[PDB]
Amino acid sequence: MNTPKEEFQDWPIVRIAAHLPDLIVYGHFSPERPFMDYFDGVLMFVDISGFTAMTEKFSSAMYMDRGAEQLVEILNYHISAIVEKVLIFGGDILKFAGDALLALWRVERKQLKNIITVVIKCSLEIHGLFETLDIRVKIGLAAGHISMLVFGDETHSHFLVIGQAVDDVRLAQNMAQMNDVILSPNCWQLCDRSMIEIESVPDQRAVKVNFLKPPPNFNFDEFFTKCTTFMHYYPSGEHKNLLRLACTLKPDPELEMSLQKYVMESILKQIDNKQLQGYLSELRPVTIVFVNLMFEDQDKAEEIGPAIQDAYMHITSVLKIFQGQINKVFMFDKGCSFLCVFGFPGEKVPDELTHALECAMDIFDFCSQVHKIQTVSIGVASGIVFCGIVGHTVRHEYTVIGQKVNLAARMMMYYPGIVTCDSVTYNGSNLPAYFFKELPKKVMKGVADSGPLYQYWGRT
Amino acid sequence: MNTPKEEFQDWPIVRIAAHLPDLIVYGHFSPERPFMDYFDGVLMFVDISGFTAMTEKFSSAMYMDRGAEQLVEILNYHISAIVEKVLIFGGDILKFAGDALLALWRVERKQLKNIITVVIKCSLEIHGLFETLDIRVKIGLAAGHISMLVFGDETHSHFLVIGQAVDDVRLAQNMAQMNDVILSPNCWQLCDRSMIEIESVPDQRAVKVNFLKPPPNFNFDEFFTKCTTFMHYYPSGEHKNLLRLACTLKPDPELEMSLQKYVMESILKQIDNKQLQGYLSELRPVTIVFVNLMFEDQDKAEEIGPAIQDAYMHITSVLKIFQGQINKVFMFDKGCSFLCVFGFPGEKVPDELTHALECAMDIFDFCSQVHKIQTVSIGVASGIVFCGIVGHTVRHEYTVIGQKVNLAARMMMYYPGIVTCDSVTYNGSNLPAYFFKELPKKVMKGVADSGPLYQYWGRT
Amino acid sequence: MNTPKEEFQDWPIVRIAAHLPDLIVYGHFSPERPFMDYFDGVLMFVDISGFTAMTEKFSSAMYMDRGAEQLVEILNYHISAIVEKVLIFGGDILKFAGDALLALWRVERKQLKNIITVVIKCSLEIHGLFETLDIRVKIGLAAGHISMLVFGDETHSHFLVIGQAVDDVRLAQNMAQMNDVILSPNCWQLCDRSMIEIESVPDQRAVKVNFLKPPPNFNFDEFFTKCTTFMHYYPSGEHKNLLRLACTLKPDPELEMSLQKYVMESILKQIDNKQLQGYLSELRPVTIVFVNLMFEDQDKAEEIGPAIQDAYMHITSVLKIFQGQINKVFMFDKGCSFLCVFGFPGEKVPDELTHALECAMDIFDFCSQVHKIQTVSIGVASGIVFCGIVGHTVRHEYTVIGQKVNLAARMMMYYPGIVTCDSVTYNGSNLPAYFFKELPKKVMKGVADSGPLYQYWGRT
Numbered sequence A, B, C: 001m002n003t004p005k006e007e008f009q010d011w012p013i014v015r016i017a018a019h020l021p022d023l024i025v026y027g028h029f030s031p032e033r034p035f036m037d038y039f040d041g042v043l044m045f046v047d048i049s050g051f052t053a054m055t056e057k058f059s060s061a062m063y064m065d066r067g068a069e070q071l072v073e074i075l076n077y078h079i080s081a082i083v084e085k086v087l088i089f090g091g092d093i094l095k096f097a098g099d100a101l102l103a104l105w106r107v108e109r110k111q112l113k114n115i116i117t118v119v120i121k122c123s124l125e126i127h128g129l130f131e132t133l134d135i136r137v138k139i140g141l142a143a144g145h146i147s148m149l150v151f152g153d154e155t156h157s158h159f160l161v162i163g164q165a166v167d168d169v170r171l172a173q174n175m176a177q178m179n180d181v182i183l184s185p186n187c188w189q190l191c192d193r194s195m196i197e198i199e200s201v202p203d204q205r206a207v208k209v210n211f212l213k214p215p216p217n218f219n220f221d222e223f224f225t226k227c228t229t230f231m232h233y234y235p236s237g238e239h240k241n242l243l244r245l246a247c248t249l250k251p252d253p254e255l256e257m258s259l260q261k262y263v264m265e266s267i268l269k270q271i272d273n274k275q276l277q278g279y280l281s282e283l284r285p286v287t288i289v290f291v292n293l294m295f296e297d298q299d300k301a302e303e304i305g306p307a308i309q310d311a312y313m314h315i316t317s318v319l320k321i322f323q324g325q326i327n328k329v330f331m332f333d334k335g336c337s338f339l340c341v342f343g344f345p346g347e348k349v350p351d352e353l354t355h356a357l358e359c360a361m362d363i364f365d366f367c368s369q370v371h372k373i374q375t376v377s378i379g380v381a382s383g384i385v386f387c388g389i390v391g392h393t394v395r396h397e398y399t400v401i402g403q404k405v406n407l408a409a410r411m412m413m414y415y416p417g418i419v420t421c422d423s424v425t426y427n428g429s430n431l432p433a434y435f436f437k438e439l440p441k442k443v444m445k446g447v448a449d450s451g452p453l454y455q456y457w458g459r460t
Ligand SMILES: Nc1ncnc2c1ncn2[C@@H]1O[C@H](COP(=O)(O)CP(=O)(O)OP(=O)(O)O)[C@@H](O)[C@H]1O
Pocket: A047, A048, A049, A050, A051, A052, A053, A096, A097, A098, A099, A328, A339, A399, A400, A401, A402, A405, A406, A407, A409, A410, A445, A446
């Protein structure tokens, strides 16, 4: 009797799980919203610098209208290698945000110290990938308490991580110079100091890592193996040649119904072989509406949870009216941000700029009266941005990348408490001019020669 | 000199052969119509129960318009495993019909006894697959004389098996309770009784299998190996890691021209990479016209052959006028049935319900005067049904699944001699009401709360 | 720590390199136009005979409108095997032209003799493939000095080989009978005569190969291995199981920008997963405009280079005006030919026949006054031709095949110095009849019952 080879089956449920971390794929938690969970772990925030510039460049005539295709190709080539490292060292990639990504190693408190060592080593191997484009990487690491929030409605779900380790990992990464691995103070507080040579960082309790210098008889591979005891989903045994246990998921309608809610319809369409796999890679003009919500305490998940849910229910019904799409949600320095987009592929509408502004105002007014929301700020910018599926085959997400994405983000941060917009949006919208106010020019981190900015004042 | 690896070539001819059994693929017989052939073998009729219900359910709002995608996924996952078993135990899968399938082990008369043992074991291993959805399987087995009919015209070909083993395998399967393997009387008559523990079945000469209990020194794997001597196409040698010898077919225009006639144009389009692979998986409203032809002797292939051919030539020219499609042809309890469909993907027409009724009447009137056709009955029902490619990668077919498919089938059987229709077809058609007659409600096996049924009486 | 398997990555840059020889892929030369390079090597011109006939046949009703699909399938099946041989014996496939292909073994002068032996053996193994369709192969081999020309503009590039070895390899192949391997006189002059049994060829200095008869202790495999020392890109080591080193190319924007210019936009679209992979295989009516340019000395690359460039700049701006496309450029017996096509897939325009004629006249008049161009001849024919990607997965090109392609080629050769056209083009064009002159019928190699031919005289 033959024993023929089983071919890898690439079922829809497996294709969907590529878009989600194990935190969600194997999380099996209540379908009630908000849902909050609490655990400990180590975070790695890997930032690529140089891509919003390359993005601008690939618009130029030299790429012969294959700019989006070339950009996605070169981007994925690099990011794939970072994703392999993270996964092979046992991390869960939680989210992609432009050219950056956040990864988690979830463990019991007592194992934090050893895991931090695994993560530091992963970090240094990722720094190593780029001694070989004007691109390099900064890495922030944090460790401690983490909360998960799941929010949404009956057809769509989003998740977020929250808490002091989350805010820290961002702080850490923003202190880094090109090539630094920075540890949060709590990460440095909890780590095995006999292993790692650091240096101080100016007016900063965080630290920079210089070296991983392990004692005479330390064998990384045996240390790693001990560490895998604490890793629920590390591929092993018959499946040790796979990057992710999720590659072995089998059809299961209940599970697929749950997971599909995290993924955009147009992605699902491609997953279902009803749209060419290259239709979603595009350099196309869009409008980013970037919404920031600040709370008195952005680590109190039980407080901010209901608020984010309340805001999400409003934001989604307002966006629905204009094929606006929430592309990502995540904690910023201050607050929870919604990266919303008008004009993704297959979703254009006329008078997009006007609608973006009115939808922004509507969100601003509703969110400003939600209970625990202390301040709403919204940034609106329009231009050519890259849209596409970024990452590795086994772990990837739809993202947007562009100077306008960064500008909308910097506007909501540098002009808090109002709805602001760029010149492009101001000029192309069809609204009375006295609904705007022209603003003072602020010098904004990672932004040059933005034309005039405006506040969208609305009627009076 | 390198000896590089040859990649599996997935030529069109190989993709086409996935839709056909070895009986046709390697049959190389005359292109004249009808063609009849005569042989012996063992048949396995594997029925899944629970799928026309799941089908109804996947229409519900909870599947978020990915009902067809989820249904095909979960269905193929299960049916694939059954197809692997059948093929690995050396069977030829002849046909898929909804959620059921018919398999053949063709052998010389003197080998029937040993083969029946292989098939029983395959059966019990398939029962085993579902101790793990509200779905299970019934299996009927038969053995004896079998006839093949090939019929059609210059562009399309269909085949059918006919004879007492064919009628028996159906009888057997319809006696089964959930999980039974039933043997036909002749199968039980011919089998190695020292191997198998049976039990009697009420007012029935057939039997149920309880156990395969083989003598002290019986080694299944050596027994199987001896059995493969009689299996023409069992993959072996260099190709023992393949499920089907047909995976090694090479381009051959003469052969491809012949095989393509069995497959629907829209499938060929997908095979030719001219249509997305997911366009044919759909939950869509259609009209089933189910045509049953009864003969005085439904095992006399030389008699019924010319008649089925004569009917097919008419039916195809009438359907052609409305993009109606013959989806399958097969012997029922009584007679030869044509499962015809109006509104498959890419094939909708307006006033589909009207046309279905007029085409039915036309077929009824022509077929009723074909020489050896004793009775024509036609069932017409309309609703949401699943359309798609069901089975394994290496062996699959386009099929339809739905409560309306079963209803049209039960109508033609429970209201013989007339053209009948459902409420949906009655209400939506555009014909004078006095062309119909409202019928008595019959209680019909595997059917609840069908609204009123009607006879399509036609003009007078 | 796992070491998971890397999946073959099928990046766009690798898909693009399938369309190009290593000569271009790894050539890294100046982007200035014309560019000329000079080297030595051995050439193999492999011609298939029988395909323009099969092509005509696959138009017939028996193929049920899957003629293009069947033709490409059977063609690639055969041509793939020839491509594997050539690559495994270390050749660089330079170009496909209909059902023929040109291959190069580039080496230092001192290694010509040994390489010629490798190539002869490859040739005889390719002859061997077809003892098994009314198709066989003729092979011409040449050796000596070769020049490369690269020409084009900022968005498109073409290349050509030029010189006496190039003209010879064609002469040689045109002397061959079905199944002969013919060597050019210089090839025979340079080869290891102790190895090969030849015979004379009538009124011809070239020779036919009868046998490869190697001395007592000659071991082909060790001889081959020594020969690979001189082969820059022979896959080896970790990559010895690949047909081409180009399968390992990594994303590199600069390189991709350069390579993409050699490939048609519609191909790039399919490469980018923005068009179904089967859209470019078609039997479709087109118009071939075949342009031949003769120079006093068709081996003087430094002379003919600027001229071909000058002509190309004109030809491309004239074709652009009508979605006309240059499909291939190559040296003929006399001169440089441009195989231009009106009506490729996605590129039809109305009044195609008229435009073909006016574009031909325009090209004729401009090219006739380019400096070193001694004679321009243009052939115009219209009909059903096969369009598609021909070759192996790892090495393939878009080509056209048809009796009309050959006719346009024979017209420009047998009616030099004028623009000629066929009956189809004459009848369907919308021009005054007195712009044409009906010509004497010439008996033309590999052409029967072409209706009347005409000269396109133009206005007076
Ligand atoms: N797709 C995306 N998702 C989430 N945030 C994004 C984003 N694209 C841009 N941003 C926001 O834009 C802000 C500016 O980003 P930075 O991290 O300072 C740019 P960089 O990494 O130095 O170079 P880059 O712009 O080439 O990536 C970030 O704080 C980030 O939150």
